Amino acid sequence: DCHLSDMLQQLHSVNASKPSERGLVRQEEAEDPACIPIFWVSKWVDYSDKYGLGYQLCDNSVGVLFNDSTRLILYNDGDSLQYIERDGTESYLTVSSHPNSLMKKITLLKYFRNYMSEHLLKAGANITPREGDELARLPYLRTWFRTRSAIILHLSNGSVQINFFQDHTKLILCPLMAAVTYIDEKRDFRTYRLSLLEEYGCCKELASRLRYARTMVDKLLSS
Numbered sequence: 366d367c368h369l370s371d372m373l374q375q376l377h378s379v380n381a382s383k384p385s386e387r388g389l390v391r392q393e394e395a396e397d398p399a400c401i402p403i404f405w406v407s408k409w410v411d412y413s414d415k416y417g418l419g420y421q422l423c424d425n426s427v428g429v430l431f432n433d434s435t436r437l438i439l440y441n442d443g444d445s446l447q448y449i450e451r452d453g454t455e456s457y458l459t460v461s462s463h464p465n466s467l468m469k470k471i472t473l474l475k476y477f478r479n480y481m482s483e484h485l486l487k488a489g490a491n492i493t494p495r496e497g498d499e500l501a502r503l504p505y506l507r508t509w510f511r512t513r514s515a516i517i518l519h520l521s522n523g524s525v526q527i528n529f530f531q532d533h534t535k536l537i538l539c540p541l542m543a544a545v546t547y548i549d550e551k552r553d554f555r556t557y558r559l560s561l562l563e564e565y566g567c568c569k570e571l572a573s574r575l576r577y578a579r580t581m582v583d584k585l586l587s588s
Contacts, residue, residue, distance in 0.1 A: 366507075368523025369586050372540040376579040379559045385573075387566035395561030400544035401495040402556070404504055405537045406518050406526050408485040410477050411511070418509055419477025420518070423489055427478045429470070430506045437470050438505055439478065446471070449505060488528075488535065492554045508585060517581045527581055529574070536574055538582075545578075547571050 384390075408421040417431035425441040436449040439460070448467065449455045458464055460471060504522035511517070518526040525538045537546040546556040549570070557567070567575075 366519075366523065366586070368540045369519075369525075369582060371543075372523070372525060372538060373579065373582050373586060375540060375543050375559045376538075376575060376582060379563050380572075380576055380579055382563040383572075384562050384567045384575075385569040385571075390566035390568060392555075392557065392562065392565055392567040392571070394565040395557040395567070396555055397544065397558050397561075398556065399495065400539070400542045400556045400558060401492065402524065402537050402539055402542075402544075402546055403494045403497040403501060404520065404522065404524065405489060405546070406506075406520075406528075407487045407489060408481040409516065409518070409528075410480055410485075411516070412477075416473050418506065419474070419481070420506060421478075421481050421485075421487070422503070423487070423492075423494060424503075426503060427474060427481070428505055429474050429477060430509065431470065431473075435470070436505050437467070437474050438503065439474055440503065447503075447505070489548060489554060491552060508588070510584070510588075512581075515577070515581070517585070519585055525578070525582060525585065527574070527578055534570075534574065536578055538578060545571075545575070547574070 405423050406420050407423045410419040417429050419429045421427050428438040430436050434451050438447040444459050444461050446458050504520040507521045508519045515527050515529045523540050527536045532550045534550055535548040543559045544556055548554050
């Protein structure tokens, strides 16, 4: 990923500046609502022991990255699908066409949609995403993994989202904007330009999560 490499450079640069080591932190100066993401993962379900990783994006679309490395996405109209084969060959179809070869995968996607609707809360439900470019592409989950502390979700638009288990905090990193959105323990959401965190500083909490992010982005790059 060229986006991952860019992301690693941006995280290298903010972390090398040691942004929490400042007499007065002024992280509010680094905020930019123009940079609020269009897409992030709002719900996820790890059924990787049998089927794959089901997820919802903040626009209510649902996707799955299956164990066989294919991906199926159901748009928020409730009928349009995008199917992505193992070589990343994509095609579009509808649920209403009931294609026999995809019936199992559609059934699994509907299972995740139902589970998520009944049993999970929507991350960032208090946030209105920025106005997208009208022709922006809905991303899919490119890769993910879990560590003891977090789940790391790499979207096909280059975004990397890290969800921390212990405190429910989350980072959404966007390399095109060179921005980070941090959702804290109390669900307050702020979006910052990474370069401006270098200049103005940030709290030790964000600084530490940004160190952790760099290591996660290195893991993404090596695998």
